[PDB]
Structures are given as structure tokens and as C-alpha cells.
Amino acid sequence: NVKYGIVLDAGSSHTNLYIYKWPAEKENVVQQLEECQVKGPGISKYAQKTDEIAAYLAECMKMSTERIPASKQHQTPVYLGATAGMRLLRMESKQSADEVLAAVSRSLKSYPFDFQGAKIITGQEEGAYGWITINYLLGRFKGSTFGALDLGGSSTQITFVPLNSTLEAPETSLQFRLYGTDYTVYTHSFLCYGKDQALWQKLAQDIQVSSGGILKDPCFYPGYKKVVNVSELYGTPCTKRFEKKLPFNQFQVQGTGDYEQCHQSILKIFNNSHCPYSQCAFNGVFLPPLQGSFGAFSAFYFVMDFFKKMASSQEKMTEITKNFCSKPWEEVKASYPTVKEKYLSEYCFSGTYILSLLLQGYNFTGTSWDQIHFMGKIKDSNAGWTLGYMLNLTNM
């Protein structure tokens, strides 16, 4: 009759559970049925308290047992795929990552579902699956495909079929089989270049021993203030190249709300000086010339949508972002009183970062800018990697 699959997306920010449903397969489509966002941080934050993982995953796991008919449960696969937050934790300590993942398996296995495993998926998988999700939901697997742009807290992915495929960096190519049609995508995940790790890089780059424990920052609203722990700041492999001895344990970010100085400061965490290829993105990584249209999703959509709702070209988006950046923090909280301050306080930075990333990192300048479509859902399913992952895992 109908079948069910559960995918946990363990990202650096949140874990999200997805329930998928599809007609029982017949010789004569998968859709998202329900989503749950686990309360709390990403699972790597449990590294020293894996005793709490089970409790952590319980509310959303219960949703799933309440939601899928009991008969149907034993035959429903459950998989957790973790992404860059967990790649970072593994770079830090293989053994912590493993203890996290083992605690997740023991938790999940304790449910009525068919445990298919808890893995840290690769950056190429993450990007390829995202491209699969969006082209599947756009009907493209029945011609040319849409490229895929994914932004999260800890990494960002770009995936697309390029005009001419090369040996230039064949660890950036992925070939796979989809409905008799075989595809070669370019795909790269830029670890540390998700929006949250990019901000840590920027703060570590810019903090001065000089400063009395203050960092004025043009990427935050005039009057915004936030205290940062230096041990948290340097607690990620992403800021290792910037570690300094600071004579303080903690510092206050003080916003100065200036978009073009923000833009300039962001560009400093990008390195454009070495490119052992025809052309590159940044940090000497190969990128072929852009080709076709793109779907941009996850944080790309949640951040751009917020600016669009304030208003749609590159010039127009730059202008809206510059104006918003310079609004004082009290005004911003008062104009958007329903928005969690943890997201609201970031929109100036994230918006300027997305613009820098797309326009300077990937060269979606001018004419190409219209080739990007920001997307949350297609036919009611989240754009993301999980859907494509479920199609694959479904042997589909």
C-alpha cells in the first residue's frame, strides 16, 4: 500500500528528522510527510555527554512512533546522516565522534524501526544528494539540470553538471546512475565556509590583543553587543590558523553597522592568491565555469527570503542589505519582534556573507545572478540532501 522512511539530518546547528512516504512500489513518488526539529544544538555538542543523546532524540522519535501506523513500523528504515559539524568534531577527535555516533545508534536501535545506520556522510555525498533532491522535485529526471547551492552552519556546497567535464580535479567529479541516465557532476563542499564557521573565522581574524576585550565589527547593527568566549572561538578547527595569545578570556563584539566594511572584512577569510587550475572558487579549489540555472537552499533561502520579504536583482539585494545593516539593534528587534534574537542578530552578517560567497567566491556576477533561484520547498518537500538520500537508500 504505502511505505515510510525516516532520515535524521544531523547538521551543525540542529538535528532535523524527516518522515517520507511513498506508495508501495508496483510494476504498475516519495514525498515529505512530516518534519521534526530536535530541541537543542547539533549532536557534536554531546561529545562529552553522550549519555544525553537518547533523551535529546526522544521527542522527535516519539513523533515518529505516534505518526507511522504500528503495523508499518517494523518495515520502515531509519537513517541518521551527519554533516560538517561532525566532520569538525572528528578532525578534533576521532574517538569523540565515534562515541557520539555509537550513542545515536544505540538510541535509534531501541525504537520499533529498521535501523539502517548512523554515519557522517561525505561532503560530495551531501552535495550530490542535494542536487538529486532538487532535480527530482523539479521533474528534471525525465534535458538539462539545475545546479544546487547549499549553505549551513559549518560548510557550503556547490554541485552542477558543467559544460565540459575535465580531469582538472577529478576528486571534484561524481558520476552516478539515475533512471538509465548517467550523470557527471562537479561537486565541492567547502568545510569552515558555512555561515557560522565563517563568522568564527572573521572574529578570530579580526580580534586584537590590543583591544581591551572589545571588537568593533561592521557586520553587526549599530549598538549590537555580544560577549564571545575565546575558548569557544578557538574550539573549532576553522579558527586554528588565526590563534593568537589574547590577554583576555572573553571579548565583547560591538556592532558598527557598515555593509561595505563588512563586505571587505569577509573577503579577508577568502584566499584568491593560489590556483593550480584553469580557474578556482577560493582557497585554490577548482571550479568549472558556471553553467545553467541553480537552486539555492537551506540557509541560502532562509536568509535571502528574509531580505526579499523586506523589498529582485543583485543591486537591489545589496541595497536592502546595506540599509538593514545600518539600522540600530534596538530598532531591528522592535521591527521584527517575533524573530528569535539568535537568528535576527545574524542577518546583516549572513546576508553580506551570502552575497560575497555567490558573487566573489563563485562569480555569479551580473548576467549570472538571475540564474539563481532561492528555494525552500518544492511540491511540499524540503529542498536539502535528505530526500535524495532516501531515494538512494530506497534503491531508487
Which does residue 42 bind out of Na ion, Cl ion, its own copies, none, counting CB within 5 to 8 angstroms by kind? Cl ion
Q: At its nearest, how many Å lie between its own copies and the CB of residue 221? A: 28
Residue with cell 516519495: 30
Dump strand ranges (E) for the chain. Answer: 2-10, 15-23, 31-37, 77-82, 114-120, 147-151, 155-160, 173-178, 181-191, 214-217, 225-229, 250-255, 294-298, 372-374, 377-378, 381-382
Contact between 85 and Cl ion by CB under 5 A: the answer reads: yes
Contact between 392 and Na ion by CB under 5 A: the answer reads: no
Contact between 238 and its own copies by CB under 8 A: the answer reads: yes
Q: Which stretch binds Na ion (CB under 5 A): 30-38, 112-120, 144-152, 360-368?
A: 360-368
- Binding residue for its own copies, selected from 115, 141, 234, 277, defined by CB under 8 A: 277
Contact between 125 and its own copies by CB under 8 A: the answer reads: yes
- Binding residue for Na ion, selected from 116, 166, 363, 394, defined by CB under 5 A: 363
Contact between 286 and its own copies by CB under 8 A: the answer reads: yes
Contact between 96 and Na ion by CB under 5 A: the answer reads: no
Beta bridge partner(s), residue 372: 294
How distant, in Å, are the alpha carbons of 23, 87, 102, 126, 264 from that of 119?
27, 11, 10, 12, 38
Quote the CA–CA distance of 303 and 348 in Å, as a whole number: 9
Contact between 384 and Cl ion by CB under 5 A: the answer reads: no
Quote the CA–CA distance of 9 and 161 in Å, as a whole number: 25
- The footprint of its own copies on this chain (CB under 8 A) covers a number of residues equal to 38
C-beta closer to its own copies: residue 78 or 169: 169
Q: At its nearest, how many Å lie between its own copies and the CB of residue 152? A: 14
CB atoms within 10 A of CB 190: 22
Contact between 153 and Cl ion by CB under 5 A: the answer reads: yes
Per-residue b/e over 157-177, b at no fewer than 16 CB within 10 Å? Answer: bbbbbbeeeeebbeebbbeee
Q: At its nearest, how many Å lie between its own copies and the CB of residue 84? A: 8
Q: At its nearest, how many Å lie between its own copies and the CB of residue 241? A: 5
The residue count for the chain: 396
Which does residue 238 bind out of Cl ion, its own copies, Na ion, none, counting CB within 5 to 8 angstroms by kind? its own copies
Contact between 44 and Cl ion by CB under 5 A: the answer reads: yes
Residue among 59, 126, 315, 330 flagged as catalytic: 126
Cell of 226: 555580544
**Largest Cα span, the chain:** 72
C-beta closer to Na ion: residue 356 or 382: 356
Contact between 283 and Na ion by CB under 5 A: the answer reads: no
- Binding residue for its own copies, selected from 278, 312, 323, 365, defined by CB under 8 A: 278
Q: At its nearest, how many Å lie between its own copies and the CB of residue 282? A: 9
First to last CA, the chain: 17
Q: Which stretch binds Cl ion (CB under 5 A): 17-25, 110-118, 135-143, 150-158?
A: 150-158
**Phi and psi at residue 86, to the nearest 5°:** -75, -30
Which does residue 194 bind out of Na ion, Cl ion, its own copies, none, counting CB within 5 to 8 angstroms by kind? Cl ion
Quote the CA–CA distance of 128 and 299 in Å, as a whole number: 17
Contact between 170 and its own copies by CB under 8 A: the answer reads: yes
CB atoms within 10 A of CB 296: 25
Q: At its nearest, how many Å lie between its own copies and the CB of residue 48? A: 20
Q: How many CA atoms lie within 13 A of 378 on its CB side?
A: 23
C-alpha triplet 190, 195, 200: angle, nearest 5°: 95
Which does residue 223 bind out of Na ion, its own copies, Cl ion, none, counting CB within 5 to 8 angstroms by kind? Cl ion
Please check whether residue 259 is in contact with residue 326, taking contact to mean a CB–CB distance below 8 angstroms. yes
Query: Of 74, 73, 90, which is closest to residue 82 (Cα–Cα)?
Result: 90
Contact between 391 and its own copies by CB under 8 A: the answer reads: no
Catalytic-residue membership of 243: no
Contact between 168 and its own copies by CB under 8 A: the answer reads: yes
Q: Which residues are catalytic?
A: 126
User: Which residues lie near Na ion (CB under 5 A)?
Assistant: 363
User: Which residues lie near Cl ion (CB under 5 A)?
Assistant: 11-12, 42-44, 84-86, 152-155, 194, 196, 223, 278, 288, 328-330, 336, 338
